[PDB]
């Protein structure tokens, strides 16, 4: 009858209509966990203001929105009806969406799961690379809202870079994306894996996440048999501050100005379809940006998405985690070594300290 | 019987004794695929005069020399012996070291190589994660050779997950695990530290920090993931921008925060030199971690005589013969913003290989 797991789906989200966007956009200048800001109360309000129209045209530009909850929701779904028979004994499974800046937040999530008198709660990010400012963020949320007890059990499946059905849906969008370039293009055909740039001043502080998504690139490489060549770039990058790159739109640009025209573009870090694909990889970098340079062919691997094999890789996560009784990875127990947020090591010892 | 098949070992270097360091230094500030400077052939020599006193303080810190020459060849002699076994119709195997800076020069190995009259050359660089800084500068010279080959060419001009590679650097650090009080072991962090790279060449396209990325995550599978860790880079000279959090910083950082058990793992070289001997071993685990309040600093062995690594040398120049690739796939995509026009012409040199 009731539910006893709970799965916690974590992710930032994005606005589902044009009306969303300037609530998206305060939330996020409010986080310190991402940005701190002089007179930030006054700021951000402010700044997310002046953003809203430029966003919103954004979102207007994929047909009024983020597909991210509907994906998240089937993925859920798909889970946890695996779940129900995989581990009858945690059953019967339940899936929440925890969105940081969005609603369902993270905050009304968790209320929901106290509600239902759940056995055990597991917080399960979507980012399969770990960022302190991503999943970090999001389990930073979890512990700051039981501070302002829980009446569950918690533990954190906190990342997930090379699981190995994470790494078959990747290299079978690949291969079925390659097989859209012409025959006669397709061992010319480059591979840009993409991932979400991060700030030099984050990078150099000792977040996890540029290695841990080298890591997945190199297993989908090994998957493919390395049948073409490859190299990892970021994209997102704003403001002046140094990021890390190279950047993508730059890397498109500068390989077919070097001849190398033919260009399959891989979101290696998200697991759905959102602003970066829809907008960032396919309109602006692929229709404006790659016509300007003279590119003969560029695609975009598909999101995994809708693919029942994902939501085998999310329930095969889930009931691993569940049998190995583990609170969080070893990685987890370690913060960053310049880390400068007090708050890191709280949510770390939330996890570490939990009963059972 | 005459050599059949010549090994080319292909390595920076770095100076065997003091007298050494002056022209190490020189032929370095002369490279354009490293460094561009004003009037680099005036400038060259003097900065090579003003560092030498330095650098060579360095290397008496450390009995007065680079190891790098002795390391290189006991593992070439016995990837040979390996070699012949397993390939008897390739077989005599022969060795030779071609370092860019210091004898044996890449181009006085491979006049030797002529003169011996092997049928074929392989380039077979002892970095296992490829930038164009390194592996890619020793194929720029045997390209440049040639330029200013009576032998079949082809490279290894990568293997950075190699699984005898990676079982060895997981031996290692159990190995030194083994070596901290058994009371602070699974609070042990592990540092795995590779030589860091200047943000422009990394922001143009640089395949290194990817590919080092990936051996450290197939060690970590390996050792499954027993101690926590993070990938720092080590050897930030200058004021500009370089990547990653720096080794000595994380070290400092993490004795500040409580984390006073670290395990330094060079993940990006396979023997010991000034990285290790002097920068790890004096620089950082003997002064910066007195003035810190480290309780056990340790670094994992480097590679050096394991017979399991000249092991991991054979079966990769076997499975390359009988794979018969001149190259690896990724030596055919050069970096998306490189600027220099010998890439593409070393890259050519090798796809084009008769055979
Ligand atoms: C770089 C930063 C990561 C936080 C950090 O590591 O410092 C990320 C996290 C969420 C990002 C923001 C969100 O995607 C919302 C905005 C989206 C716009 O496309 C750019 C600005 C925008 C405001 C982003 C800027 C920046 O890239 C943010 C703030
Ligand atoms: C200095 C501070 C960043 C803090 C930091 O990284 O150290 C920056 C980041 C965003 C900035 C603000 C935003 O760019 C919005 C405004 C833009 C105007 O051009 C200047 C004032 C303005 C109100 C900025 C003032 C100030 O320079 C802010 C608040
Ligand atoms: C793009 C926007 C400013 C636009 C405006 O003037 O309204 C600013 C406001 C706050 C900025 C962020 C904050 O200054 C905090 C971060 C500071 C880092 O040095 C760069 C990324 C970083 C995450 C910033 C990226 C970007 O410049 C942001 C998102
Ligand atoms: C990585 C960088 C080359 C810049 C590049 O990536 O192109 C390397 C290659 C060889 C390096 C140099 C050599 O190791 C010799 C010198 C050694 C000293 O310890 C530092 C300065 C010194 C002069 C080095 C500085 C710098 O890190 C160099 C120049
Ligand atoms: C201009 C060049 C950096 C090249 C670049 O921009 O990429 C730098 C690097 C090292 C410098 C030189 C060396 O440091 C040695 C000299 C040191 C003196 O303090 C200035 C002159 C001096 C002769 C330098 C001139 C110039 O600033 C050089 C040549
Ligand atoms: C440290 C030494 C300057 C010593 C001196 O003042 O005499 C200089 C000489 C040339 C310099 C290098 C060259 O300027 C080329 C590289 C340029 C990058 O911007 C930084 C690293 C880079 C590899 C430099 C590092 C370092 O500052 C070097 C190696
Ligand atoms: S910023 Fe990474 S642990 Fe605090
Ligand atoms: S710099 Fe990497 S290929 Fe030229």
Same mark, same amino acid.
């Given at each position: 009858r009731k539910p006893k797991t709970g799965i916690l789906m974590l992710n930032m989200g994005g606005p589902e209509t044009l009306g969303d966007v300037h609530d998206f956009l305060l939330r996020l200048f409010l986080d310190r966990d991402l940005m701190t800001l002089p007179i930030q109360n006054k700021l951000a309000p402010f700044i997310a203001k002046r953003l809203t129209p430029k966003i919103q045209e954004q979102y207007r530009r994929?047909?009024?929105?983020?597909?991210?909850?509907?994906?998240?929701?089937?993925?859920?779904?798909?889970?946890?009806?695996?779940?129900?028979e995989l581990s009858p004994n945690t059953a019967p499974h339940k899936y929440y969406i925890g969105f940081r800046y969005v609603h369902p937040l993270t905050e009304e999530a968790i209320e929901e799961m106290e509600r239902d008198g759940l056995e055990?709660?597991?917080?399960?990010?979507?980012?399969?690379?770990?960022?302190?400012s991503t999943t970090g963020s999001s389990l930073n949320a979890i512990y700051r809202y039981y501070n302002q007890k829980p009446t569950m059990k918690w533990s954190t499946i906190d990342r997930w870079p090379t699981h190995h059905l994470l790494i078959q849906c990747f290299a079978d969008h690949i291969l079925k994306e390659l097989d859209h370039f012409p025959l006669?293009?397709?061992?010319?055909?480059?591979?840009?894996?993409?991932?979400?740039?991060?700030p030099m001043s984050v990078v150099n502080r000792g977040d996890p996440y540029p290695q841990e998504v080298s890591a997945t690139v190199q297993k989908v490489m090994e998957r493919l048999e390395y049948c073409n060549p490859y190299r990892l770039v970021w994209q997102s990058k704003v403001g002046p501050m140094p990021?890390?790159?190279?950047?993508?739109? #730059? !890397?498109?640009? =500068?390989?077919?100005?070097?001849?190398?025209?033919?260009?399959? @573009?891989?979101?290696?870090?998200?697991? &759905?379809?959102?602003?970066?694909?829809?907008?960032?990889?396919?309109?602006?970098y692929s229709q404006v940006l790659?016509?300007?340079?003279?590119?003969?062919?560029?695609?975009?691997? #598909? !999101?995994?998405? =809708?693919?029942?094999?994902?939501?085998?890789?999310?329930?095969? @996560?889930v009931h691993s985690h569940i049998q &190995?009784?583990?609170?969080?990875?070893?990685?987890?127990?370690?913060s960053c070594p310049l880390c400068v947020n007090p708050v890191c090591r709280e949510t770390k010892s939330f996890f570490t300290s939990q009963q059972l």
């Open positions: 994929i047909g009024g929105g983020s597909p991210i909850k509907i994906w998240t929701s089937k993925q859920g779904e798909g889970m946890v009806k695996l779940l129900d055990r709660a597991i917080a399960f990010t979507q980012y399969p690379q770990y960022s302190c006669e293009k397709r061992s010319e055909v480059v591979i840009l894996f993409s991932a979400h740039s991060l990021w890390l790159g190279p950047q993508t739109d #730059e !890397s498109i640009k =500068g390989l077919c100005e070097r001849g190398r025209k033919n260009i399959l @573009l891989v979101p290696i870090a998200a697991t &759905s379809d959102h602003i970066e694909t829809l907008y960032e990889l396919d309109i602006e790659a016509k300007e340079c003279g590119v003969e062919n560029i695609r975009r691997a #598909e !999101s995994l998405n =809708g693919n029942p094999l994902f939501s085998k890789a999310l329930a095969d @996560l &190995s009784n583990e609170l969080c990875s070893k990685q987890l127990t370690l």
